[PDB]
Amino acid sequence: DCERFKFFCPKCGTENIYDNVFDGSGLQIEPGLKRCSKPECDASPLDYVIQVHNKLLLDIRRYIKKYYSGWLVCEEKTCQNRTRRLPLSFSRNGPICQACSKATLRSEYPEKALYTQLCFYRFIFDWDYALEKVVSEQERGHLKKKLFQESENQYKKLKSTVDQVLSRSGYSEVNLSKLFQ
Amino acid sequence: TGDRKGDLYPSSLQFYQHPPTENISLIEFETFAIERLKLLKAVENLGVSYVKNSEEYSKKLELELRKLKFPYRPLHEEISDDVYDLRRKDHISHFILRLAYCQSEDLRRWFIQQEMDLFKFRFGLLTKESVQEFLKLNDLQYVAISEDEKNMHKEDLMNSSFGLSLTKMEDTEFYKVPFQAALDLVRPRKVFLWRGFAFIPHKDIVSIVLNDFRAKLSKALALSARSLPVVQSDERLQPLLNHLSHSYIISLEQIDGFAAKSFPLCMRQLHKSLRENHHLRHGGRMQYGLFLKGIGLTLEQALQFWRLEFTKGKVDSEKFDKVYAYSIRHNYGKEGKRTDYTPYSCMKVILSNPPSQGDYHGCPFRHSDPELLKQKLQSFKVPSSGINQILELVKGMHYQLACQKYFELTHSVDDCGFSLNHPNQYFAESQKLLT
DNA sequence: TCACGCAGTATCCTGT
RNA sequence: GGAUACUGC
Ligand code: SF4
Ligand SMILES: [Mg+2]
Ligand SMILES: [Zn+2]
Ligand SMILES: [Zn+2]
């Protein structure tokens, strides 16, 4: 349910959808940001990594704004009341919808949604995880050589941004004392 | 001991008694959880594939431990920072997996088994010095009799245990038990008694250690299952812990097919009614359950089939386990007198409870009017000559011969070649002919 | 010579 | 399908 990373090529202007670190199969597999999605386009998005960084930050801002908008929808199908205002009148399950007074208001974009979106943006830039889990054996061998070290470094830098953002999220510390007692 | 270390991790092996108190990151949490899941799955696979004492088992387990960077070998150097890190990993990961593997008894058992295996391996890699260190740090106080006391009673121990050699005895360690627990040993005088304690023999020491470990671990898992509500509220850790066990790191469906060809007409009628209405009166339930037991449907398989079929009948799911589970178990000799009840014989079916309105059990050839039997035979595309012959046989009161004629016509065989006297015999013959 | 009605939940068994 | 219990209203 997470939005994929959309980046418009500076040269051709075609949208590139990124959902994994690597694209292709077998020896034809390469990092997604190595070649444009348009065959006629020779531009490498890895060249415009500053632009990719800026777009990533803008997307993170967009998702944080969506979360903090605090939109609530009534869970009742026959009400579906949409409000920004959280009422202080609560039932055992949560805020009581003030349109029908009989159903609970649920967040349109809960904290889990934002956390999963940030985790996905980290996932689409996790070189090591992709190599271990996603990639196959022959593909892993082909990707664990030189000719990709620069791409690996750029991917590490891009993942650093999402890691930094997630480090500032309360949904980034686990108190083991509270778990084990 | 670089920055924030301590004496919290003296030895490599531990009983995992004290929960961690640190504040870790979500990334560290996930990495540790997945890594230990990989380790435990590797342990399980190697245990299935190889004998745990085999050298291949040891080599592969060492390779996995090295790959995932878990403590497996001692180091007579000191507590190096890296070593500390590894031990910390182990300690936290274990408890995380506890949180993952305490929801269901099955899971609990699995966890315990894997953990025990790992512990055994690690013990097997401990030098005697290290071994003693461990046995001291956990207040196990095995010198379990001391070595000095063993030498003190060497001759008595030698003459106590049957078939124990001098050197082999030197290689063995005994235990001290109150004589009230060794009744079966003391009574025939096969264990030495000194001052109210028997010296019972067990390579074996690991066994005792493991016993202790297992006890503790089981208790811990119980407690964890008791403290589950506090964790379910933490959404961050719910997707992981609730699904870690499912983390990537005869069939019921064919029964319908069988009903096309192999099932005798009685079972065909019962199955048709069941799929038409998702409910059978008691006689039909008994007959069909016994038949499906006969074909080979296991208790789990039969339970699943009946659950799925009845749930569609607009009844509560719990109602099935409340009511029909006992009947299904009994048909397989699981409860009550616990008798492996045999499938109904054709004689029983003919002479069993007579079906009435709303029922579909019994032998159709006997409990179906001739017009109804003719219609049913026509429906199955039987040749007119075959239908007439079957009707003639039915009029002769030899319904078993009628079923034999049905088998001959449907299987395209001139002669059945067998005296049909059991529906399971019918199904077996059909399977033999087809497969 | 006897003995109130009905609605509902829980447990257990089906060889000669 | 049956059998044995005892709650409620
Ligand atoms: S003769 Fe036996 S197998 Fe054939 S329909 Fe009757 S009961 Fe079933
Ligand atoms: Mg009933
Ligand atoms: Zn392009
Ligand atoms: Zn509402």
Automatic annotation (TrEMBL), chain B:
Stated role: Regulatory subunit of the DNA primase complex and component of the DNA polymerase alpha complex (also known as the alpha DNA polymerase-primase complex) which play an essential role in the initiation of DNA synthesis. The primase subunit of the polymerase alpha complex initiates DNA synthesis by oligomerising short RNA primers on both leading and lagging strands.
UniProt GO cellular component terms: alpha DNA polymerase:primase complex
InterPro entries assigned to the protein according to its UniProt record, in alphabetical order: DNA_primase_C (IPR058560), DNA_primase_lsu_euk (IPR016558), DNA_primase_lsu_euk/arc (IPR007238)
UniProt keyword terms in alphabetical order: 4Fe-4S, DNA replication, DNA-binding, Iron, Iron-sulfur, Metal-binding, Primosome
UniProt protein name: DNA primase large subunit
Necessary cofactors: [4Fe-4S] cluster
Subunit structure: Heterodimer of a catalytic subunit PRIM1 and a regulatory subunit PRIM2, also known as the DNA primase complex. Interacts via (C-terminus) with PRIM1. Component of the alpha DNA polymerase complex (also known as the alpha DNA polymerase-primase complex) consisting of four subunits: the catalytic subunit POLA1, the regulatory subunit POLA2, and the primase complex subunits PRIM1 and PRIM2 respectively. Within the complex, POLA1 directly interacts with PRIM2.
Cofactor binding note of this UniProt entry: Binds 1 [4Fe-4S] cluster.
A Pfam family matched in the record: DNA_primase_lrg
Keyword Plastid: no
Residues covered by the DNA primase large subunit C-terminal domain: 259-427
Keyword Ribosomal protein: no
Binding residues annotated for [4Fe-4S] cluster, in chain numbering: 266, 346, 363, 403
Similarity remark: Belongs to the eukaryotic-type primase large subunit family.
Lineage: Eukaryota, Metazoa, Chordata, Craniata, Vertebrata
Organism of derivation: Xenopus laevis (African clawed frog)
